[model samples]
Target: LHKEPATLIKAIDGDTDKLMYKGQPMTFRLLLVDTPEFNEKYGPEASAFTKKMVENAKKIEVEFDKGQRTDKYGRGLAYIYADGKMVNEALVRQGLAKVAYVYKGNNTHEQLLRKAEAQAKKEKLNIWS
Candidate 1:
């Protein structure tokens, strides 16, 4: 239902699954990216990385990558653009996460994302290490 880029009131935790916006709590599943759960190994690190990005972002924008807006978990689905960088790509590039739930037909930055993941893995960074 959020068809616009809502201000990030605050993050729920290190992970990017939940956040506060416009006086209401909303869950957003960052499309095309999946990080380790906070309870799993490296999960805390991933969460911390995500939180840092959120805080460091000078501007935040959201775009519906595909027609389907939500996943099975009932969270709104979209790609978050922070400043001029794509948050989804940032996570993969740093090796803090991996690409998941991507649709071939719904792709826009698919090639760019694949390249970022390749670079991360090649350097044995984060999750790759």
Candidate 2:
């Protein structure tokens, strides 16, 4: 697993899965989770949640999966960590996002993410409700 420290520029307005990273302003997509668009239900809430997490973190970093590094749009595809906790898993656990866009050979935290989603579903939080 390769991890690189990054600075949060700003969270994208419509998508919780996407964010602006670094002082240079690179765009990144959070792997293994899908949040609704800002126009859709719960989208704003999801975006806010993600923004709060990253903004409040003392440290931020990105870890690329073994398979794909970037998507078709040239957005870096990776998992985000805030203060050492995985933000991707946090979003799923909180029911702000769903486990999705999984590709073979990119199962680094697939089981962990699925387990978090299951717990969120059982608790009937946000989207799960």
Candidate 3:
């Protein structure tokens, strides 16, 4: 009942998708965080970095105790688990993302995201580092 097969995605906006992922149209269900723009934030290296993250994360785990799936707006809502870890939480750990405005204080993922944020701040992973 606890194990579920899943895909770990590096979330992106439609416009930014094409820029980072070789012009492929993409959409994302906003998590409890935000990322910097590819050019302004990540610089020219973002495309390659994003590409690597996607290629490496083709498979992930899906843990669904509650709130399993999309949340209105037809966007896929998932707590991405990749490489034996949660990608949603990873972003925070990386300091590549900030708490999202909408889904804040919502669920287990949100709580986990907060935990990741603390770790990122404590250890200084990506942006925090």
Candidate 4:
């Protein structure tokens, strides 16, 4: 099946959890980026960013460094990128998400992400709180 960017569509029939590329099920991660804010449920920008991340992956190229491209549960676990930028790290840099795991060598991006986010926080970038 073709892999399209994931998005949460405002449809009439659904559980409202979040749909995948093919309208399949999804288990979206809670990233450390801070760009999008979430309020009650997620924060301030959770829903919007979640939709964008999935959508962006389809248009761009994202690679799985180590773990299986898709987990046994069928959810994708990949390092996404667009135009040469690491989309995963992009989120933290812009305060849109954060690292959820310290997966062995796979966490290389974590440090970088943390640094970027830290810098952004120090400078009062997108997420100062």
What overall lDDT goes with each candidate model? Answer: 0.72, 0.83, 0.51, 0.47
lDDT of predicted model 1:
0.72
Number of the top-ranking candidate, with lDDT as the measure: 2
- Runs off by more than 4 Å, candidate 1: 1-4, 12-15, 19-25
Per-model TM-score versus the true fold = 0.83, 0.91, 0.59, 0.55
Where in model 3 is the C-alpha error above 4 Å? 1-3, 7-30, 43-51, 63-65, 102-105, 123-126
TM-score rank, highest first? 2, 1, 3, 4
Residue 102 lDDT (model 1): 78
lDDT of 4 by residue, 26-115 (tens): 543322222333443334454455445544544443344444445455545555444445556755655555445555644445677778
Which candidate has the top score in TM-score?
A: 2
lDDT of 2 by residue, 7-58 (tens): 8777884233344455556788888889988888779888898888888998
Give the alpha carbon lDDT tens digit for every residue of 1-129 in model 1. Answer: 123455565654333645444445678777777788888767888787777777787776666765676667777677777676777888889898787767765566677888999999999997898
Give the poorly placed runs of model 4, Cα more than 4 Å off: 1-46, 49-58, 125-127
Lowest summed lDDT window (length 10), candidate 4: 9-18
Off by over 4 Å in 2: 13-23
**Which residue pairs in model 1 clash with each other?**
none
The TM-score obtained by model 4 is: 0.55
